Design a binder for this molecule. Structure first.
Ligand SMILES: [Cl-]
Ligand SMILES: [Cl-]
Ligand SMILES: [Mg+2]
Ligand SMILES: [Mg+2]
Ligand SMILES: [Mg+2]
Ligand SMILES: [Mg+2]
Ligand SMILES: [Mg+2]
Ligand SMILES: [Mg+2]
Ligand SMILES: [Mg+2]
Ligand SMILES: [Mg+2]
Ligand SMILES: [Mg+2]
Ligand SMILES: [Mg+2]
Ligand code: NI
Ligand code: NI
Lengths: 363, 363, 363, 363, 363
């Protein structure tokens, strides 16, 4: 047997190696909530959240400790717990901060059940450890073309061996021609065999989206990601239709049902759920089922360690989004080989906290 | 009157003249199940199955002999038999192996019925013997461009006289540019007036299909065949809308109803039913009713002899798929003239086994 | 071989045993065109048309003789002939009188082909002679409840043995209350386990149809047939939705494609093609593929002899519509046994003209 | 008051100045049926049918005279007579030869009604005589590119003055490249100012239609007309969507409801009802209500005189189709000026027969 | 020849025999605008408008007169006039007051055109004078049941002979249950053979409409008219779906295109255009072509005289709405016989102003 004892959630703030350079402002900081579960039987559980907004950690940590109090003494069973955490907060929404806290609990609980089985997570879910093809989203923010191009060479090599086969390139400069120029410069530096995933981060309104995505539709991008506000399914459907290049969304899906509603609306060619919004491992697995049936290629967003684990059992696995923003809190991040992330043969997610860096960065 | 006595199914394995060089592996062997029907009145029936997977014959031969036992003494009437054979295995599915056994019975009993009428099959079905425009699918597997271009010269010539007006060219190499290079080499060699039908054999996921089919959309191909796994109708609907070049599927339709559902789902521009999957002659004639109503051009897959006969009475007959992989077990294969297959003036399908090649290759 | 020599069309006009009593008038005469085909090899073909409008025989007999001149010396191949005949009249329409001529030729040609094979038509089409469940449409025209009920007793009795399991009851009286009263009086006389198929013969506009079909929706009818004008598909779709009782149409389908269109539009729950409009045996078999794919129960209209043959090989065979209106000119009408029509074991349709009744009624 | 007495239909076979050179054969002859109405009040009605196939006049004349007998003594009211002609043959189809007969009657009767009112037909319908822009469909059949280019010059000039602003060009040659060459050669000769309306005459199957219409989609055609068989609404919907050039159909619409169904199916961008199929003037004015509500531009097919009249009152009037195949039997064909056809200030249609030519070409 | 000289429009305010007794207030005044046309050739035109709102006549009279000035000297051609009037006010909307002015001109102009041809309007339109089934909308306002039942006996007798076969019963009392009692009381007094058309006059919101139309759906009403505000097509679609009783709208359609949109939206089972809103005779005729293609039973609203003329040529004519509100200003209104309005054998609408009643009620 396996019984939930308590959950501890510790907020930390990390200084990015390469700060987010958007048009609106520059963001140098990256918040993380570290989550440790204890069971009566002495099996630990470890995972983390990346909630983007440092301030919101002040709402999430309390919400996590409330969930811990609620769940104390009950079976550590991810699916049961997933149902209790959501119901507890249905009155203030299944989407949003409610889901975010519930997902954090979920990943840590799955990690604990896997350790209890003495299995890597992916093995518990019915696969095995192995490689997962990945792309580098460490940077390529809205700097100058020559700066971005030089960074692109570094980001590629971060993949080891032959390098990453893809890079995420951000767009949304005041002047569209520079975005193209930046894309053209990057390919000149790293070679055209490299896949470029472009991301607008919801920066455009529909009119801007139409003109701008059309300008880049014949560039040969791997995909065009979230050009408008994430819940505009009417707009996405129009864009998907006009665009030949694959249209990518999903990082803002709050649960499998929302994915299912996006697909019924014909809103996208590709999807990439985020682990804290989709409902953790449980939400992902259900979402993989939906994506599986529609046959839509499915990628990840953030959480490279959990992502690599579930991608090993995801029917339509497409790309794993890789970045090292969370690396400092880990004793050993997963190894890279030829741009492929390697799931290590360790129980659960195989995460161990670097407590020095944690203490040096606690809030 | 005409009465079913028994049915014999004999498994053979032929050495292909040109090995199937796919991406995963090279396949040198081609399995065939020879079917001989006996009636109480002495009228024989002869047809064959081409089930691809040699191990599968050990599931199909037993299934055929069980059908033989069940049919013994009953009237040799294809439409009644098609009903009893399907009904007997409905619990283990109408589609797949069940259908395949029922389709082999069906082709052979229609052979017997046409013999009993002393009519060629096409004539019993309401047409007459004649020629059917064909294309050559003997090869053009995944070898080098210069090697495929040379092989193409030979394949066109197998058509006799002015040769085949079309060739099937397989695509799916690791590097998409080499697929294109191969098409260009082939067209240089045999001339651009030669139609090229491109087949990916379900080897791509959706994202790969979107990119690769787009790259070849302006080449001038006759059609693009099964880019993705065959039951992904949502994906096919998408590909077909985006591609200007006709999208072709159908070889994995299990029955007319499945064809009808694919057309309702807007999955394809063209269809090419396979005789062992569609329900033999009975299935084909029904799918032809469906295709005729929609106005969808209908082509064949494998079984060039049965194909030529039914194509003579198919309202939307398009292209016949010709290969000579099964020729060795026949005393006389159908003649070719300028790329048309000639249906001979013989009762039934006019097959007589070469019992030397059979014994030389029996399993 | 088998070669078309000539075709002769003789118009005859018969006094109906039970005259058509509608609201507009009383139609007492039934026209038939008797078709005889000769081949160079001495095989005959015989079939007939029931074109409803006596004077229309002056358009069809010439049309049929014109087709005989065109076909002269060509192979007697039904599928090919069906192409040729329909093609020769395409400027004056595929639907309507053109189709009626082609249909007559088609049925007779199929009869000849089957004779050539020494097989009953149904056997040639892949089935066997046997029984086909029928219902009686000889009468139950718009008379008084008392009269209709007493006639219903005789009508059930024409079935032999336990009698017809179904009767066609015509409706469309000035006072709908009397239609209902009539239906009730019939069930009172022949018993409630007798299926009543109600036919309105296109007598109503949509508002009347909405009112009257609703009034009878709960009587327990077998079906409701053509309440409005036959090409009002928008209307039929509305009626079909509002009514729970099955809605029946199709006797005015000109070809399999038109059936396809009615089904896409959602116009009906059941279909009943007429052989002179659907395209004869060739048209029926195509439409049977379409109906089979959709799963729509398929019934016949007129031509009980051809009807019984093709229903033996029609996948979704429902009811055969039986009447004795053309019996007079046949030497041996098909036998009836417990309301089933018995397809006799004779070549083709096994029709032989009763020349005494022909001369007596020739036009 | 105005009373129908009798109707006379005279079959006539003319020789075309420029013979129809198609792919399959060459038709030099053009059948006509001159129709004459007599009224008890001494007012005549004159109109003609152009039924394409000479042999079909054998069916129509008997049908026309059968309608005379039926209408004799009844009020000469076009709408009432339209109702009564259709209903009399509904059993042998609303479409096809029956509609053709009714339309001929309908045109003569509308002509009589306009004469009785002493107004040109267009004036009776609420308009006034005037010019109607036309295009020349006299030829450009399937001849040598140079032969067609030369003819195109003569054709523009038949329009008088600055000439016809549009020409019908027939496509469908064995080699599609020569179709295009012909377009380019016709333009070289008459200037790119000239609109080209391409017509395939239903000569293609769907696969041919897809390839070929795509090849000509960037040529700058005014429209592409009936590429495939006229009732294939599913195929037309696909072509319309794939093609940017407008897709024209409708010359084979039998009645206003059929146009309505085509538009619901998304079958076309432009329509061009033919007066013998659409139901004469009654049918046209109803069709114009439909096209007017959809906003679909409506053009005509054959019958330049009736055509010019109704176009004057057609809300979405587009192009008139002009040809002079019927000219010989008219004393005074309508005047041409700078491409526009001039509706004269004569009562009715203003037709008078040249009884010399009639007698010379009677049957 | 026929030329427009001037149009005079005279406001008159009558006092209804039976005052309008709605839920909100009682309305005893009925405004009419009388319209007279002068042609250069001395042919007159007479028709009237019923704008409901007395003060509106001050917007319309200046609008009609402004139209007179612009039309001065141009040909009196309804179709052409219909286009010029509508065009001149397109900047201030095609629907609404613009249309109402244009419709008044259109009816008066068609009257003149018919007079100039010495024909009744219906004869000019292809019909003949005759009877048209009518229903009585003179009263049955929101009084008590026994009062309404009493008035009903009176209203039915106004139809002469066997009486009106239909009555319009208004609903929308504060208390629904009394609406129901009123229907029964009317039926208890005039017999259940009499059709009741129920009109709510847009008086409900959707919740009330759902509840109240449902409560009366089993009463046996001829139809249910306009329960909610007239432009709520979403709501009507729902109501029409839920209600088995036919749902009637249309009196508020501004033009044939609006009817087309309503049908496309599935908004109703029946339509009843109003002549000032639909576009007079021109708009009606076009709308009749639309309605005719759909098979929608079409009825009239107000203007019994113009209505009876067009109903004689309306393919799906259903019910004529008859009331005697405008009678006082006519010398000889149309006769009734057994509930059928009689179109008299007189040129145009046969309207002549009783000028003493006009002088007596002028504004
Ligand atoms: Cl789903
Ligand atoms: Cl279908
Ligand atoms: Mg992103
Ligand atoms: Mg797209
Ligand atoms: Mg294939
Ligand atoms: Mg496509
Ligand atoms: Mg019937
Ligand atoms: Mg239903
Ligand atoms: Mg044409
Ligand atoms: Mg288009
Ligand atoms: Mg009202
Ligand atoms: Mg309803
Ligand atoms: Ni599109
Ligand atoms: Ni429903």
């Amino acid at each position: 047997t396996l019984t939930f004892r308590k959950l501890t959630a510790r907020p930390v703030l990390l200084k990015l190696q390469r700060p987010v350079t958007a048009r609106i402002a520059t963001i140098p900081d990256w918040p993380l909530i570290l989550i440790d579960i204890e069971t009566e039987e002495g099996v630990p559980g470890r995972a983390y959240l990346e909630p983007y907004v440092p301030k919101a950690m002040k709402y999430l940590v309390p919400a996590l400790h409330d969930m811990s109090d609620m769940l104390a003494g009950q079976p550590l069973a991810p699916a049961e717990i997933y149902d209790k955490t959501r119901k507890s907060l249905h009155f203030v929404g299944y989407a949003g901060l409610s889901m975010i806290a519930a997902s954090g609990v979920d990943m840590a609980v799955w990690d604990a059940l896997a350790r209890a089985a003495n299995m890597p997570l992916c093995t518990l879910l019915g696969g095995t450890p192995g490689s997962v093809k990945a792309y580098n989203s460490n940077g390529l923010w809205l700097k100058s073309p020559a700066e971005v191009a030089a960074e692109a060479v570094e980001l590629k090599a971060e993949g080891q061996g032959t390098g990453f086969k893809g890079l995420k390139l951000r767009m949304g400069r005041d002047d569209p021609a520079v975005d193209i120029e930046t894309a053209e410069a990057v390919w000149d530096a790293v070679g055209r065999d490299t896949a470029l995933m472009v991301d607008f981060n919801q920066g455009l309104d529909m009119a801007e989206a139409m003109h701008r995505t059309r300008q880049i539709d014949d560039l040969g991008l791997e995909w065009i990601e979230e050009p408008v506000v994430y819940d505009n399914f009417d707009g996405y459907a129009q864009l998907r239709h006009d665009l030949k290049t694959p249209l990518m969304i999903g990082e803002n899906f709050y649960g499998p049902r929302e994915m299912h509603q996006a697909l019924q609306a014909g809103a996208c060619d590709l999807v990439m759920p985020d682990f804290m919004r989709i409902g953790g491992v449980s939400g992902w697995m259900r979402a993989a089922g939906v994506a599986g049936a529609w046959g839509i290629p499915m990628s990840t967003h953030l959480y490279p360690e959990v992502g690599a684990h579930v991608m090993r059992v995801t029917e339509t696995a497409h790309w794993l989004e890789w970045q090292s923003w969370a690396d400092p809190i880990l004793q050993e991040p997963y190894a890279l080989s030829d741009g492929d992330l390697i799931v290590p043969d360790k129980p659960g997610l195989g995460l161990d906290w670097d407590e020095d860096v944690v203490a040096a960065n606690l809030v």
